[PDB]
Design a protein around this ligand. Structure first.
Ligand code: 6HE
Ligand SMILES: CC1(C)[C@@H]2CC[C@@]1(C)C(=O)C2
Ligand SMILES: [Cl-]
Ligand SMILES: [K+]
Length: 405
């Protein structure tokens, strides 16, 4: 459905891109979004899809708007409007100054010191999952590794039972790639139905898990409220269940299709961290945005208070104006420019955990299964939304070419 064109929007800026089902999707989701960077498309366009909103199509504008929280507010950060209105996670639904005091608590539970506490378990799980698949000569990568690896690390960190994964993963997916059976508000309320009793249990009887730490936390020296704790835990759950999960599949699909790049990392394993960064650029996958706090002329375009603007994190690094030959993967790329983990005051606090999970996966997969390919006659289908992903990734290999560690 196409929403009526607002009176202030000129026809020449209309480009009806659908972020939940882009027309070029069969080419790959990054490719589908990159249609917005064809030479005839303006830096800033209006789509009538998904209730109507602006889209910044170039890194320069995306960065500028993420920096300018005074004009571009995180209050309503998701499209469609009903989702952005319902979205109340902390700290990502707040602007500075209010936002900042909550970042330290989040950092405590998912940041670098916690990555250190989890290091051995991350390593052990990657190795065990991969060794279990190795002799089979095939896997369904999304279900067999991309999901269980990061999700089990998260459930461990959060002290939540693994048998709760199917329910939580379903709900989280309705917030990022809704199947239409639940509004964002309904999925949010269901997630809160889950979290509220657990938060009170852990305020009564604290453990050492992330939910206990948030629920008993202090925010600039005063106690967090039960409600604030719930809103922070919601963000942590969505980050844990729907980010790295999708990214690993883009990366493994690429490696399955590029024997040369696999060989590069096998021969020169020291390049794996740089490879991770270049894959984070090329297979960037997030697109949220902001709401205008006032009428504002931005790059020659009249924006009105209340207008939503999608600021795709994915697009900055794909912009030829930021990286030459942007669709080409070059592990030796000198300046890897991207906003994959966001930009401005809301830079991802989970990024150290994400990079560890990625780097461990690349190392431990290629150690055991250096030679693999896409299953015979398979056509890999992507999916688009707030976080984009891979529907299924069937891989095959000859077990004789593998190595048990
Ligand atoms: C378990 C926690 C976790 C994990 C695994 C991630 N994130 Fe992070 N994240 C990302 C973006 C673009 C933003 C800013 C959003 C905005 O400005 O509105 C955040 C912010 C955040 C913030 C503020 C938090 C607490 C957060 N994200 C937890 C978080 C992207 C990512 C990506 C691309 C990955 C993985 C590849 C990721 N996150 C893993
Ligand atoms: C946009 C995000 C990737 C970032 C972490 C999870 C996510 C869906 C959010 O709600 C904030
Ligand atoms: Cl934040
Ligand atoms: K909101």
């Amino acid at each position: 459905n196409l929403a009526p064109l607002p009176p202030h929007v000129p026809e020449h800026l209309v480009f009806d891109f659908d972020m939940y089902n882009p027309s070029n999707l069969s080419a790959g989701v990054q490719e589908a979004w990159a249609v917005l960077q064809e030479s005839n498309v303006p830096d800033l366009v209006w789509t009538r899809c998904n209730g109507g909103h602006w889209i910044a199509t170039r890194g320069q504008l995306i960065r500028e708007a993420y920096e300018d929280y005074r004009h571009f507010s995180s209050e309503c950060p998701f499209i469609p409007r009903e989702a952005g209105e319902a979205y109340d996670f902390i700290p990502t639904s707040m602007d500075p100054p209010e936002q900042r005091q909550f970042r330290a608590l989040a950092n405590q539970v998912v940041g670098m010191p916690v990555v250190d506490k989890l290091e051995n378990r991350i390593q052990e799980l990657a190795c065990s999952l991969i060794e279990s698949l190795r002799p089979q000569g095939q896997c369904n990568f999304t279900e067999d590794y991309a999901e269980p690896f990061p999700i089990r690390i998260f459930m461990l960190l959060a002290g939540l039972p693994e048998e709760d994964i199917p329910h939580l993963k379903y709900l989280t997916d309705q917030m990022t790639r809704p199947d239409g059976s639940m509004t964002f508000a309904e999925a949010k309320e269901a997630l809160y139905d889950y979290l509220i009793p657990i938060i009170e249990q852990r305020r009564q009887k604290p453990g050492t898990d992330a939910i206990s730490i948030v629920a008993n936390g202090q925010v600039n020296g005063r106690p967090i409220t039960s409600d604030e704790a719930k809103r922070m835990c919601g963000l942590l759950l969505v980050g844990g269940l729907d980010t790295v999960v999708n990214f690993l599949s883009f990366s493994m699909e690429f490696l399955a299709k590029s024997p040369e790049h696999r060989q590069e990392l096998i021969e020169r394993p020291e390049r794996i961290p740089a490879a991770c960064e270049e894959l984070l650029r090329r297979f960037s996958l997030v697109a949220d945005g902001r709401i205008l706090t006032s009428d504002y002329e931005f790059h020659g375009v009249q924006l009105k208070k209340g207008d939503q603007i999608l600021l795709p994190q994915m697009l900055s690094g794909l912009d030829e104006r930021e990286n030459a030959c942007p669709m080409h993967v070059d592990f030796s790329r000198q300046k890897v420019s991207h906003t994959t983990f966001g930009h401005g005051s809301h830079l991802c606090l989970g990024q150290h955990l994400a990079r560890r999970e990625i780097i461990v996966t690349l190392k431990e997969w290629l150690t055991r299964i250096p030679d693999f390919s896409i299953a015979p006659g398979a056509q890999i289908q992507h999916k688009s939304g707030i976080v984009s992903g891979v529907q299924a990734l069937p891989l095959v290999w000859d077990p004789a070419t593998t190595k048990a560690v």
